[PDB]
Design a binder for this molecule. Structure first.
Ligand SMILES: [Ca+2]
Length: 313
DNA sequence: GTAGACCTGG
DNA sequence: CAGGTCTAC
């Protein structure tokens, strides 16, 4: 009975396991729907379900605990090894209290604004999902992006399991996305011109860059190196590259500059371009603005930016 | 080194 | 009308 549908902490207590984690270090309601990953849904109030480490999970938290439950057979509580995967996904080793202190210490503005928005951290995402999810972010809003990514995974990703009327799918592989007629197919799913970038980048990686390995090892390369490489892919400009660097390649100093960030820079810092004579967003002015926040916040400027983006809603 | 074109739900 | 990327003078 309760053995069907998405679980909740109450309905199947013996199936959940917890990870010590204070809400000051993580607010699911601030991270999961914030445009880092687009594959988490709050199917039950305060409960988020999505694919993590190739399996489906539901997560919910109390004041000091991050409660997790996994759907693989034979119903059972998450093993310690599995829970680890959750910890790594949320990079729980990176201490938020420490980062907030540092940023608050060097930025009076961050100071005030951050008090009301604690728990905003960066998800450690898979390079492929992050690469194609953000290729779909172009001239698009979170709601539409979520739909496109969803249709995309349903059509080309492996079927995992079914909860209620939701069939979860793993993210498509490079082979799948590189397949014949993927573009036309993606266009039917509404991805528009982005359909072409998805197809083109899948093939470029597989047939020109050396495949998945080329991408995966960027995590060991330098931020400037990683950012440089990523920009080779079609549909991947400096902005989506920074997103990938920050979100999947362990480059915490990466700062994706979009119009949103410009608004923050102008309104909350009275910032203006020093180098370029261009007064608005341009390849040159965007690069600079990114440098501005890096010198202000430090080695984790990217994480700091996420905090401001949350409080800005 | 700065404009329209690219797609389409609103 | 709306998060960028791409390419033409
Ligand atoms: Ca490119």
């Amino acid at each position: 009975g309760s053995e069907f549908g998405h679980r909740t902490l109450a309905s199947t207590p013996a199936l959940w396991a917890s990870i010590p984690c204070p809400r000051s270090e993580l607010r699911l309601d601030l991270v999961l729907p914030s445009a880092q990953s687009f594959r988490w849904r709050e199917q039950s109030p305060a409960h988020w379900s999505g694919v993590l480490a190739d399996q489906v999970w539901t997560l919910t938290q109390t004041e000091e605990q991050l409660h997790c439950t996994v759907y693989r057979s034979q119903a059972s509580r998450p093993t310690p090894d599995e829970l680890e995967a959750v910890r790594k996904y949320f990079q729980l080793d990176v201490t938020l209290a420490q980062l907030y202190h540092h940023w608050g210490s060097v930025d009076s503005h961050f100071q005030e604004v951050a008090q009301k928005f604690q728990g905003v951290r960066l998800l450690r995402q898979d390079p492929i999902e992050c690469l194609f999810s953000f290729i779909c972010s172009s001239c698009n809003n979170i709601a539409r992006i979520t739909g496109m990514v969803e249709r995309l995974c349903q059509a080309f990703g492996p079927r995992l399991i079914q909860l209620d009327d939701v069939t979860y799918h793993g993210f498509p592989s490079l082979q799948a996305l590189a397949g014949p007629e993927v573009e036309a197919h993606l266009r039917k799913l509404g991805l528009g011109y982005r359909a072409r970038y998805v197809s083109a980048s899948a093939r470029a990686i597989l047939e020109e860059q050396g495949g998945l390995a080329w991408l995966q090892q960027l995590r060991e390369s330098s931020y400037e190196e990683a950012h440089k490489a990523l920009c080779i892919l079609p549909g991947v400009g400096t902005q989506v590259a920074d997103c990938i660097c920050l979100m999947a390649l362990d480059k915490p100093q990466a700062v994706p500059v979009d119009v949103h960030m410009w608004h923050i820079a102008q309104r909350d810092y009275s910032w203006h371009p020093t180098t370029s004579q261009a007064k608005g967003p341009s390849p040159q002015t965007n690069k600079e603005l990114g440098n501005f926040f890096r010198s202000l916040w430090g080695p984790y400027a990217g994480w700091a930016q996420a905090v401001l983006f949350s409080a800005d809603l």
